[PDB]
Amino acid sequence: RPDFCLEPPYTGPCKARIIRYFYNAKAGLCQTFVYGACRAKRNNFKSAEDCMRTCGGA
């Protein structure tokens, strides 16, 4: 699987408050986290199925 999902999420700058999805290498899958709506990384999917299709190699 990719390594950007093994890293923690990144609310990034700004102050948005959306519940996006990221891969918790410690959870083996993804979890919800706070997104900043800007400068998003690869560990920020809009749905749990969007994360799996990407980092669903566990």
UniProtKB/Swiss-Prot annotation:
Residues at the site labelled Reactive bond for trypsin: 15-16
GO molecular function, one term: serine-type endopeptidase inhibitor activity
Gene Ontology terms: biological process: negative regulation of platelet aggregation; negative regulation of serine-type endopeptidase activity; negative regulation of thrombin-activated receptor signaling pathway; trypsinogen activation
Key word Secreted present: yes
GO cellular component terms, semicolon-separated: extracellular space; serine protease inhibitor complex
Domain BPTI/Kunitz inhibitor: 5-55
Source organism, top-level taxon: Eukaryota
Keywords recorded for this protein, A-Z: Disulfide bond, Pharmaceutical, Protease inhibitor, Secreted, Serine protease inhibitor, Signal
Localization annotation: Secreted
Bridged cysteine pairs (disulfide): 5-55, 14-38, 30-51
Known role: Inhibits trypsin, kallikrein, chymotrypsin, and plasmin.
Protein name, UniProt field: Pancreatic trypsin inhibitor
Full-length numbering of the shown residues: 36 to 93 of 100
